[PDB]
Design a protein around this ligand. Structure first.
Ligand code: ZN
Length: 671
């Protein structure tokens, strides 16, 4: 049955308390709602005093099987103070002096032999006590009587901590006592409190729990709680340095684990950053030492402009592969975008740092060290010109380290060579514009190859294999985002669609973004979205992409890249390349890397009379890719390392096609 609130007002306290004793809390209508009916109930100081006295007698008697309705009693009194906080009508409940009337009721539960945690009743009894203290008030004597529970919980930690019920019980108990105390001395001097200096046994009880040391995956949080609340309750111990010393030991115990960071946060936030010795601890040096631990190895490429700081367990082979993959993705990008001059002088992206943790587990600490999101596969922060990720097994993620490195590398390129101004800030963000584009063209460009342009990724086509009816975004629906997870895959679908079926629009888009021509880009999104035929054209493309899944591949860096190629005179490679790609006025720079040397060769290609920018682009591609493939037929193994692109399209006074052409490959001739 359900009991109403207007009813209870018309009862004796004797019948009311025995009624509350039998019922569960949820049966009462609008118990936390403020009404004209709930006012009269809590308005009677005698009514609530009865409920407390009933709780005190109920606390003196309760057993392992019999609740004695303590759960219900607590929640009712809790509802009172809740309403007494938000409403001027029940202001006497808000007063701390009246809340002290609950203390003998709490003590009754504590002095009862059934105060230990064991049965489902005893577990939720401690739960309801802690939840009450938060809303009511406690004193030193109430606090110190919790010690038999925390000692018991610590003594059988390995069994209890993994249990939700037993765990939550102890947590809520401490969480609640801290809650009351922290509000009780809100801006008052913490030494003026009646508990200050007497809480030693409870404060020392948190030490033992927090400094348990021999912890496992299932019990870390419990010791974590211990340390966090040791700091927060350590503000009520006369010996200040005793507490800080204990926190410092917690750092040293689990050095570079979760609790270590918590303990350090506790010293800087609660104790001003002054250690037990009396001098300021170096928070920055700790974070720096923490990073060096997880990222011990360093790999440097392109004259120290491409640095990978990686975990001790990520293969050198992978490092090398990731370097070469960046070159594959880069060249495709500059081809499509038609620019390779970085947009701004002396930015942080002048040197790209890539930090790769050993595992998702080890990746989580990145948030503590570098203060960036970790609820992701990877993350590029443009103002730092740094992007973070982790090595992964196939079972941890469907995307490999190279694949995600490639998606992220695209963002580096986008921010550097395409979108003028900082990433996320600028005209192209004042309104929602490039959300589909940034993620879309990223997944797309991650499909870069050496000689085949950009190719679909099997796993992305994998995603597209799902119910056709709705779900499949409209062209207009992709162009305009707040939506669901599939946005990256249909955003890609738009990018590939344009790349394969309508390159002019795709080039015009990129040029607009490059020239920061907001009115142009918007006109393009307009024409695409207002066109029903263009959507039908797009809807068909998705089907072709789905159809390609069977014989699709995952474009990755070839093993040929890793082969020891052998010496070839540097002059020979340049001449042979210059001749092959028909380049005039050529320069070349060389650059030292960790495992090898490399050359970037620039030049001007000038062909025959133009067929129009977009036919020209299409031909140039076929031309240049062919030059890369034919060069690879030469007996020098190092020709398979070549990547090439073309930028800055124009035509001469005689309509002859003109591009700037760039070549990049391995160099085995020294100096
Ligand atoms: Zn992305």
């Amino acid at each position: 049955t359900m009991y109403d609130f207007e009813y209870l007002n018309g009862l004796s306290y004797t019948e009311l308390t025995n009624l509350i004793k039998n019922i569960k809390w949820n049966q009462i209508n609008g118990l936390f709602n403020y009404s004209t009916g709930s006012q009269k109930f809590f308005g009677d100081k005698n009514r609530v005093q009865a409920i407390i006295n009933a709780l005190q007698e109920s606390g003196r008697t309760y057993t392992a099987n019999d609740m004695k309705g303590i759960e219900t009693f607590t929640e009712v009194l809790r509802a009172g103070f809740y309403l007494g906080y938000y409403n001027d009508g029940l202001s006497y409940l808000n007063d701390r002096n009246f809340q002290d009337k609950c203390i003998p009721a709490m003590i009754a539960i504590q002095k009862n032999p059934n105060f230990k945690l064991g049965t489902a009743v005893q577990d939720e009894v401690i739960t309801s006590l802690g939840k009450l203290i938060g809303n009511a008030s406690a004193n030193a004597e109430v606090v110190n009587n919790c010690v038999p529970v925390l000692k018991q919980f610590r003594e059988n930690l390995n069994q209890y901590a993994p249990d939700y019920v037993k765990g939550t019980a102890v947590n809520e108990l401490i969480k609640g006592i801290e809650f009351d105390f922290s509000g009780a001395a809100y801006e008052k001097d913490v030494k003026t409190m009646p508990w200050y200096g007497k809480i030693d046994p409870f404060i020392n009880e948190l030490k033992a729990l927090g400094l348990y040391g021999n912890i496992t995956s299932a019990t870390e949080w419990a010791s974590d709680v211990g340390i966090y609340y040791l700091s927060k309750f350590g503000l009520y111990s006369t010996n200040r340095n005793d507490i800080v010393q204990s926190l410092e030991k917690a750092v040293d115990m689990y050095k570079y684990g979760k609790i270590a960071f918590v303990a350090m946060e506790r010293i800087t936030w609660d104790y001003d950053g002054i250690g037990s010795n009396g001098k300021k601890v170096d928070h920055d040096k700790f974070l720096d030492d923490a990073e060096k631990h997880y990222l011990p190895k360093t790999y440097t490429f392109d004259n120290g402009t491409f640095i990978i700081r990686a975990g001790d367990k990520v293969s050198e082979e992978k490092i090398k592969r990731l370097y070469w993959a960046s070159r594959e993705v880069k060249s495709q990008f500059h081809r499509v975008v038609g620019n390779d001059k970085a947009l701004e002088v002396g930015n942080a992206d002048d040197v790209l740092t890539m930090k790769i943790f050993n595992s998702p587990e080890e990746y989580k600490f990145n948030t503590n060290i570098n203060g960036v999101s970790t609820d992701n596969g990877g993350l590029y922060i443009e103002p730092r010109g740094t992007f973070y990720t982790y090595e992964r097994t196939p079972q941890q993620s469907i995307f490999s380290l190279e694949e995600l490195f490639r998606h992220e590398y695209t963002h580096y390129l986008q921010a550097r060579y395409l979108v003028d101004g900082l990433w996320g800030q600028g005209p192209f963000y004042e309104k929602n514009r490039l959300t589909w584009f940034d993620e879309g063209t990223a997944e797309f460009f991650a499909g870069s190859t050496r000689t085949s342009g950009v190719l679909p990724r099997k796993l992305i086509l994998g995603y597209l294999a799902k119910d056709k009816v709705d779900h499949r975004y409209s062209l207009k629906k992709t162009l305009n985002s707040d939506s669901d997870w599939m946005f990256y895959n249909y955003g890609f679908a738009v990018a590939h669609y344009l790349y394969e079926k309508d390159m002019p629009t795709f080039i015009k888009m990129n040029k607009a973004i490059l020239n920061t021509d907001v009115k142009s880009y918007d006109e393009i999104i307009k024409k695409l979205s207002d066109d029903a035929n263009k959507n039908t054209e797009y809807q068909n493309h998705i089907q072709e992409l789905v159809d390609k899944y069977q014989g699709a591949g995952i474009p990755l860096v070839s093993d040929d890249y890793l082969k020891d190629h052998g010496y070839k005179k540097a002059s020979e490679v340049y001449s042979e390349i210059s001749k092959a790609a028909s380049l005039t006025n050529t320069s070349v720079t060389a650059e030292k890397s960790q495992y090898f040397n490399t050359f970037t060769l620039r030049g001007t290609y000038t062909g025959e009379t133009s067929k129009g920018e977009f036919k020209d682009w299409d031909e140039m591609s076929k031309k240049l890719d062919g030059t890369l493939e034919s060069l690879a037929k030469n007996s020098w193994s190092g020709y398979k390392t070549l990547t090439a692109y073309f930028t800055n399209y124009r035509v001469t006074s005689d309509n002859k096609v003109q591009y700037d052409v760039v070549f990049h490959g391995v160099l085995t001739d020294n100096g």
